[PDB]
Design an enzyme around this catalytic site. Sequence first.
Site, PDB file in Angstrom:
ATOM      1  N   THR A   1       0.791  -1.259  -0.155  1.00 18.26           N
ATOM      2  CA  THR A   1       0.015   0.018   0.101  1.00 18.26           C
ATOM      3  C   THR A   1       0.888   1.296   0.024  1.00 18.26           C
ATOM      4  OG1 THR A   1      -0.243  -0.090   2.533  1.00 18.26           O
ATOM      5  CG2 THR A   1      -1.894  -1.320   1.213  1.00 18.26           C
TER       6      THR A   1
ATOM      7  N   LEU B   1     -11.194   2.325   1.154  1.00 16.48           N
ATOM      8  CA  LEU B   1     -12.098   1.082   1.127  1.00 16.48           C
ATOM      9  C   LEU B   1     -11.619   0.038   0.185  1.00 16.48           C
ATOM     10  CD1 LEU B   1     -15.685   2.455   0.671  1.00 16.48           C
ATOM     11  CD2 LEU B   1     -14.575   1.697   2.792  1.00 16.48           C
ATOM     12  N   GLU B   2     -10.113  -0.222   0.571  1.00 17.90           N
ATOM     13  CA  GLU B   2      -9.305  -0.858  -0.471  1.00 17.90           C
ATOM     14  C   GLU B   2      -9.497  -2.477  -0.343  1.00 17.90           C
ATOM     15  OE1 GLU B   2      -5.139  -0.005  -0.699  1.00 17.90           O
ATOM     16  OE2 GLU B   2      -5.027  -1.272  -2.360  1.00 17.90           O
TER      17      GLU B   2
ATOM     18  N   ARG C   1     -11.179  11.346 -11.219  1.00 18.70           N
ATOM     19  CA  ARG C   1     -10.366  10.936 -12.153  1.00 18.70           C
ATOM     20  C   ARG C   1     -11.224  10.734 -13.704  1.00 18.70           C
ATOM     21  NH1 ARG C   1      -5.700   6.509 -10.101  1.00 18.70           N
ATOM     22  NH2 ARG C   1      -4.530   8.422  -8.918  1.00 18.70           N
TER      23      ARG C   1
ATOM     24  N   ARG D   1       4.507  -5.006 -14.731  1.00 14.16           N
ATOM     25  CA  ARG D   1       4.177  -4.477 -16.172  1.00 14.16           C
ATOM     26  C   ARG D   1       5.364  -4.523 -17.056  1.00 14.16           C
ATOM     27  NH1 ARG D   1       0.872   0.463 -13.484  1.00 14.16           N
ATOM     28  NH2 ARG D   1      -0.866  -0.646 -12.828  1.00 14.16           N
TER      29      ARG D   1
ATOM     30  N   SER E   1      -5.760  -2.703  -7.563  1.00 16.72           N
ATOM     31  CA  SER E   1      -6.157  -2.073  -6.193  1.00 16.72           C
ATOM     32  C   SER E   1      -7.385  -1.339  -6.549  1.00 16.72           C
ATOM     33  CB  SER E   1      -5.298  -0.769  -5.789  1.00 16.72           C
ATOM     34  OG  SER E   1      -3.766  -1.299  -5.440  1.00 16.72           O
TER      35      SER E   1
ATOM     36  N   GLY F   1     -10.558   4.501 -10.223  1.00 19.67           N
ATOM     37  CA  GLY F   1     -10.693   5.642 -10.976  1.00 19.67           C
ATOM     38  C   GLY F   1      -9.115   5.697 -11.413  1.00 19.67           C
ATOM     39  N   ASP F   2      -8.899   5.718 -12.737  1.00 17.40           N
ATOM     40  CA  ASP F   2      -7.643   6.072 -13.580  1.00 17.40           C
ATOM     41  C   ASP F   2      -7.433   7.152 -14.299  1.00 17.40           C
ATOM     42  OD1 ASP F   2      -5.908   3.139 -13.681  1.00 17.40           O
ATOM     43  OD2 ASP F   2      -8.061   2.825 -13.669  1.00 17.40           O
TER      44      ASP F   2
HETATM   45  N1  LIG Z   1      -7.163   3.985  -8.372  1.00 19.32           N
HETATM   46  C1  LIG Z   1      -7.689   3.577  -7.567  1.00 19.32           C
HETATM   47  O1  LIG Z   1      -9.080   3.655  -7.714  1.00 19.32           O
HETATM   48  C2  LIG Z   1      -7.615   3.041  -6.385  1.00 19.32           C
HETATM   49  C3  LIG Z   1      -8.431   2.085  -5.449  1.00 19.32           C
HETATM   50  C4  LIG Z   1      -8.068   1.860  -4.231  1.00 19.32           C
HETATM   51  C5  LIG Z   1      -6.714   1.820  -3.857  1.00 19.32           C
HETATM   52  N2  LIG Z   1      -5.907   2.672  -4.594  1.00 19.32           N
HETATM   53  C6  LIG Z   1      -6.121   3.163  -5.852  1.00 19.32           C
END
Ligand SMILES: NC(=O)c1cccnc1
Length: 208
Positions: free
Chosen positions: A37, A170-171, A143, A48, A131, A86-87
């Site tokens: 984390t 909330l991972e 994002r 990757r 994640s 979210g990216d």
């Molecule tokens: N990019 C993400 O949505 C995300 C979600 C949980 C933990 N870290 C990143």
Amino acid sequence: NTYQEFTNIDQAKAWGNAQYKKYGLSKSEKEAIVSYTKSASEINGKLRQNKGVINGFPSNLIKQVELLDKSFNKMKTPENIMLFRGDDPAYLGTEFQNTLLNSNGTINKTAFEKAKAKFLNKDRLEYGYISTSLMNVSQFAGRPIITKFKVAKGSKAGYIDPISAFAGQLEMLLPRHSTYHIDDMRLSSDGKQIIITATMMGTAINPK
Ligand SMILES: NC(=O)c1cccnc1
């Protein structure tokens, strides 16, 4: 098949905390997850770059990766669930980095069509760990790309939030080398985001 979608932060945390309490992660597995984390971008970046081959990694990183992989033997979702990410633009590829959004902060229509032609109705293999969050949490929900993953009952998935170094995520972690299928891609109501719906197939890394 219907997938559980959490609608309330407290309800999500309650459920996640209940899952985490039962995992019985070892001392070493917990250490590896905490470190993940803190250093996920480095770990996933190397995975990757090397297409999942970890032989050339530093000895400590090999051990960490193998511990994360093995920890999923204890971490499975007990039901069909929806997970979120979210990216930023680069997720779609190098060509989208500085072309996805226009000057108004709106998704460029030409870029959106190119992203659909590239990804819609196709599989995608992710070499890194994924994640995700149990909900579209505020930290990542602004994002430009939001993905909703449909993860089937029994799949490798772990609520690691209680030992994460960071708050409010909330991972739920998914294993590396996972494949998902992009079922749907559309612009949001206000045109600022691409909403992707995907079905998680599963991972090729299954130790033990
Ligand atoms: N990019 C993400 O949505 C995300 C979600 C949980 C933990 N870290 C990143």
